[PDB]
């Protein structure tokens, strides 16, 4: 929501209140999403200054505020700056931005990441190129320098982030993506590679000096129809946990498939179904093992652009004897969303 | 402050800067509230959407940002997301909202919670139904489906919160309230029940599998006059700490009495006095004990709807040989508050 | 950005998104600012209400959100509320505010605090009177009761803060400052004295029952020209750490010099140069040693009142065999700043 627009400068102060509850059997963990309260709220700004007829500047910040914490010592648990970056766009030259921003491979992963509650199970936070990641410099250009309508591309440089956990750490890397759209159809490819930190190599799981993530996506999004498919592979990049040994790290190689089918009725309901399967290979001590496997059925009912409610049921296909102890139970989500 | 009202959506972004300092004798270890800087600020949005002529959607978030911390490690000390929920209200059927919201017994306890700084001594955070509490689904109806002016009621369902601390944990529970108001007068009733967590039962102080809180309140609110009285009882629900043995948990039974007398002068002054006594029964090893017991004298000076200053003097009646080690010294509040 | 001005009340919701990167050689440990991503965002309100023709009330809060932290445990590493105070201003009598606000000695050091990123190296956070500090009661007076135009002064009270770290700790104290300006020229003097906390004296480095900070400044600021000089001394007040022995505390005496020369070109560029040298004396075990010593060359390019970019190169003069183990290497800043 835009709350300031004077002297050629405009600020969208947006956010949301998401009442959310999760339902799984018993206590939670051998489930997909867990059980209990998951309420959260968001705040953020989208700021934009027009320097001249061709040149625009912008900056955006966004925070995730949890509502499922007490006011005691754990009051801060699960809070995070999601985005904080700044950039410029000059005519048909393109845009360039630095700060904490979404990885470049996500341009593909965005295709199937559309569910009411869950989904996008391969868009891990702070996981190199597949999700939000700090210290990325990205150049983007839409329509190929303005010369070919629908042909957009991007290149991203990922700065070294030597963090405390090998899960959240990353070395220097580069990635790129191209997407093309014509009369409802879309195709996209994205690939990124990066150095790994020593702390990442000294982890029990994973072997390599280079992390690699690539993903392609197809979609049709027109006439109230949204369909999407994503296929991707990772090399020494997907974060994983051995639940029996309490050992952590990254999987040597993973194969990710996402299918999404949704329709938007004019009276407000948007039924959604999905299937996502991400399986790892050459996991040390285990070999081949499935990380994510589910069929999804759910629906969003939109009261308006300010209010909605939804329910999303994940049928988890992971086996109870999953070699990483991955939760096998189903999970259903109940949500009521006010936003601006 | 209303800063957006368009396309049937309005967002009031409200908050405050509160210069706040407490003055107590010696150091205040043994006082009511303690001594030193207690400056704070609040932030929150109230978003409200008109879906159609009868149907409103709403969503709210609210934060307490501390001003008494360094820029170091304790930077987060005392910060907390206070309120965070979303819901709908439909014609005269009523309202429903889910997320983190004020407890149902607060409907009653709200009557006496009017001091300049202190007060509402039984409306504890994450204390089941008497204060702010996570994962509650609340239904309220105003004017009894529109048929009886002044007749409001509510039913509340409290979802399980299994936490790391026994103080902030709570099991599944349900509660309700009904209030009637007539020509300056008000009467309110509230009661709530819930399972206790193992972790609460395995606590040193307190025994029971069910926590129960009820309170009834009367008030006069007209012609610049505010008078209120609240009485309530709790069973295995009020949080307590043994200061000599340094052990924590909950009191077996408590009886809470609050008297409040306030007047608002037209020239900006609002003098206030109060009396608060909350006493425990069946505390293991100690027996009967006073938790809160004080007379209060103070005044709030309102410059306008945007600026005020206040003083709140807690005349502590607690005795130096209090069996729970409760502070006996006096505490003074000095506050200067800008809000918008 | 001012987003509300109604009913004698106005609210500025302001902030920024700063993409920022540091450049140092190798790991960057042994440099001035370090190496890597330092992206951050700030958010805040400046609220001001007109109570009547002479009296305005105000309140301000300001927060630091980091953009260089993960979403993991370190999501919070370095976030903190910067300002939180409330006050009033009456005609030419003066202004008064209490809470967390800039230290009184900052009145002088502010002169040289003009660099793109760095600079003002003696304006340490929570360092008594030299930087932002918790619990100050401040009186400020402009134009001396309206009797002498340009003659401003200030008195500041520092409340006791016995913290977890002696670094962010502080005792009872008082300070004052006076400044006069005439047709581009400015001169200011500022001094503050305060009790030290027990925890500060039990530190290995530093001896005294009183911390003292004083600084004087000159500047010329007109016709796009800015020149400034600040000199100051501290007695048992500036915080220091020995990198070899891993011990911390405060320096017995410090002598601080800052020069800044800037010119503002109309096409947006503002080239900046500076020199900062702060050297300590009576450092236990070491004697005389330099904490800060550099010549600075850099430039900021303003796209307009909302957008900027900068590069700032720090030429460090500190020697590799620095007795306090202070980094000897140079540091580069690359920043792109959107604000509102």
Swiss-Prot record, chains A, B, C:
Gene3D superfamilies, per the entry: Porin
GO CC annotations, alphabetized: cell outer membrane; membrane; monoatomic ion channel complex; pore complex
Induction behaviour: By growth in low osmolarity conditions (low sugar or salt); activated at low osmolarity by OmpR, repressed at high osmolarity by OmpR (at protein level). Levels of OmpF protein decrease in a lon/ycgE double disruption (at protein level).
Major localization class: membrane
Keywords: Cell outer membrane, Ion transport, Membrane, Porin, Protein transport, Signal, Transmembrane, Transmembrane beta strand, Transport
Key word Transport present: yes
Localization per Swiss-Prot or TrEMBL: Cell outer membrane
Ranges facing Periplasmic side: 7, 52-53, 92-93, 142-149, 183, 223, 266-267, 304-305
Bilayer topology annotation: Multi-pass membrane protein
Domain of life: Bacteria
Entry's Gene Ontology BP terms: monoatomic ion transmembrane transport; protein homotrimerization; protein transport
CDD domains: gram_neg_porins
Gene Ontology terms, MF aspect: colicin transmembrane transporter activity; disordered domain specific binding; identical protein binding; lipid binding; lipopolysaccharide binding; monoatomic ion channel activity; porin activity
Membrane-spanning parts: 1-6, 8-23, 39-51, 54-66, 83-91, 94-100, 135-141, 150-159, 172-182, 184-195, 211-222, 224-235, 253-265, 268-281, 292-303, 306-315, 331-340
Extracellular side: 24-38, 67-82, 101-134, 160-171, 196-210, 236-252, 282-291, 316-330
Family, similarity comment: Belongs to the Gram-negative porin family.
Role noted for this protein: Forms pores that allow passive diffusion of small molecules across the outer membrane.
Domain notes: Each subunit of the trimer has a water-filled pore with a narrow, elliptically shaped (7 X 11 Angstroms) selectivity filter which has a solvent accessible area of 30-40 Angstroms(2).
Quaternary data: Homotrimer. Forms mixed heterotrimers with OmpC and with PhoE; other mixed heterotrimers are also probable. (Microbial infection) Trimeric complexes with colicin E3, BtuB and OmpF can be cross-linked and immunoprecipitated.
Name recorded for this polypeptide: Outer membrane porin F
Biological source species: Escherichia coli (strain K12)
């Amino acid at each position: 929501a835009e709350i300031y627009n004077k002297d050629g400068n405009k600020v969208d102060l947006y956010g949301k209140a998401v009442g959310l509850h999760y339902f799984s059997k018993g206590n939670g963990e051998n489930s997909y999403g867990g059980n209990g309260d998951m309420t959260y709220a968001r705040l953020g700004f989208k700021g934009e200054t027009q320097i001249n007829s061709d040149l625009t500047g912008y900056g955006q910040w966004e925070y995730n505020f949890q509502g499922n914490n007490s006011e005691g010592a754990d009051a801060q648990t699960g809070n995070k700056t999601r985005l904080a970056f700044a950039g410029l766009k000059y005519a048909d030259v393109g845009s360039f931005d630095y700060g904490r921003n979404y990885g470049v491979v996500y341009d593909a992963l965005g295709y199937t990441d559309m569910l009411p509650e869950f989904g996008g199970d391969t868009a891990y936070s702070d996981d190199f190129f597949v999700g939000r990641v700090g210290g990325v410099a990205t150049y983007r250009n839409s329509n190929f320098f303005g010369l070919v309508d629908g042909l957009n591309f991007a290149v991203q440089y990922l700065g070294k982030n030597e963090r405390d956990t090998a899960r959240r750490s990353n070395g220097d890397g580069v990635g790129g993506s191209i997407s093309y759209e014509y009369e409802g159809f879309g195709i996209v490819g994205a690939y990124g590679a990066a150095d790994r930190t020593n702390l990442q190599e000294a982890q029990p799981l994973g072997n390599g000096k280079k992390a690699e993530q690539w993903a392609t996506g197809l979609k049709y999004d027109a006439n109230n129809i949204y369909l999407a498919a994503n296929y991707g592979e990772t090399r020494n990049a997907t974060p994983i946990t051995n639940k029996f040994t309490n050992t952590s790290g990254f999987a040597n190689k993973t194969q990710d498939v996402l299918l999404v089918a949704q329709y938007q009725f004019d009276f407000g309901l948007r039924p959604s179904i999905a299937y996502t399967k991400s399986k790892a290979k050459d996991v040390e001590g285990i070999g081949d093992v499935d990380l994510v496997n589910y069929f999804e059925v759910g629906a969003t009912y939109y009261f308006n652009k300010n209010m909605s409610t939804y329910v999303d049921y994940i049928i988890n296909q992971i086996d109870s004897d999953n070699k990483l102890g991955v939760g096998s139970d189903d999970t259903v989500a109940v949500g009521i969303v006010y936003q601006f």
